[PDB]
Structures are given as structure tokens and as C-alpha cells.
Amino acid sequence: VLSEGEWQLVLHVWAKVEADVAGHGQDILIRLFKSHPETLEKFDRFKHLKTEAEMKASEDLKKHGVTVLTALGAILKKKGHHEAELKPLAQSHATKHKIPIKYLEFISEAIIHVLHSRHPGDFGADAQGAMNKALELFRKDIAAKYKELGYQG
Numbered sequence: 001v002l003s004e005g006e007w008q009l010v011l012h013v014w015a016k017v018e019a020d021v022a023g024h025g026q027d028i029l030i031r032l033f034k035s036h037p038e039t040l041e042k043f044d045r046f047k048h049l050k051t052e053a054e055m056k057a058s059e060d061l062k063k064h065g066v067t068v069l070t071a072l073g074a075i076l077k078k079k080g081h082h083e084a085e086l087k088p089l090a091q092s093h094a095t096k097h098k099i100p101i102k103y104l105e106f107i108s109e110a111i112i113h114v115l116h117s118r119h120p121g122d123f124g125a126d127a128q129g130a131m132n133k134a135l136e137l138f139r140k141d142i143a144a145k146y147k148e149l150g151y152q153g
């Protein structure tokens with residue numbers, strides 16, 4: 001359970017992301033895909049992209065970055081009371097997109113890295129730990145839905 005202090009650190013940085021959601025989404029998906037290439041294989045939409053320059057030039061990849069971060073923003077802003085928002089994301093990610101929990105770990109590391117790059121003065125260690133906690137709570141509650149559905153592993 002995050003404290004109100006920890007949520008304030010999380011949402012203070014997330015307000016900085018919302019000035020350039022698309023650039024953040026491109027950098028986080030690129031980092032995901034470069035750091036963990038198995039992840040790119042899950043997107044039929046993007047698996048033609050073979051260099052980081054092709055990834056940077058794809059408007060479709062930029063579009064999906066904003067889809068991702070808009071969903072994640074809506075979940076952080078519920079501070080933990082996000083059951084309505086996860087049900088569907090867990091359902092589609094387990095049963096249609098076939099995304100293991102551990103790939104949610106991977107995109108969480110990429111999210112933390114890009115926020116440290118772009119907002120170091122609002123993403124000191126206190127804020128890095130709170131945001132780690134918020135992403136862990138996201139993963140925990142999605143893993144419990146996976147498990148319900150027979151996909152935790």
C-alpha cells in the first residue's frame with residue numbers, strides 16, 4: 001500500500017510526463033524493445049522494425065506509446081483504487097496479447113529509466129522508490145487477475 005506521500009511523488013513526476021506523453025512513450029517502448037527483444041516479437045504491428053532509427057521514425061509506434069501511457073496515467077491517478085482500470089488491461093494482456101508478467105516488469109524498468117532521464121530533478125531516489133512501489137502494485141494486481149484466468153505461470 002503506498003502512502004499519501006509516496007503517491008504525491010509519483011503523481012508529481014507523472015505531471016511532468018503529461019507535457020510530452022508521445023516522446024515519453026516512444027522512448028520507453030524503444031528501450032523495452034532494445035533491452036528485451038522478446039518483447040518486440042509480441043507486436044505483429046512492430047516486428048518489422050530492425051533498428052532504433054526505424055523505431056524512432058514509426059508514427060504507429062509513437063501512437064501506441066501514447067495509448068500505453070494514457071492507460072497507465074489513468075491507473076496511477078486512482079492511487080491504488082484501480083480495479084475498474086485493470087480488469088480490462090489484464091484480460092486483454094493475458095488472453096489476447098499473451099504478455100507474461102515478467103514483460104510488465106521489463107516495461108516498468110524502461111518507464112523508470114526514461115523518467116530518470118527526462119526528470120531528474122523530480123525523480124530523485126525518494127521518487128524513484130515510490131514509483132517502483134506504484135509499478136509493483138500495478139504488476140501485483142494484474143498478476144492476481146492473470147492467476148484467476150490461468151495465465152500466471
Ligand code: HEM
Nearest residue numbers: 039042043045067068071072088089092097099103104107
Ligand atoms: C504499463 C504496461 C502497459 C500498459 C498500460 C498497456 C496498455 C495497452 C492498451 C491500453 C492497449 C490497447 C487496448 C488493449 O488491447 O488492452 C494495449 C495493447 C497491446 N499491448 Fe499493452 N500495455 C502495457 C504493457 C505491454 C507490454 C509489456 C506488452 C508486450 C511486451 C504489450 C503488448 C501489447 C500488444 C501486443 C497490444 C496490441 C497492440 C496492437 O496490435 O494494436 N503491452 N496495451
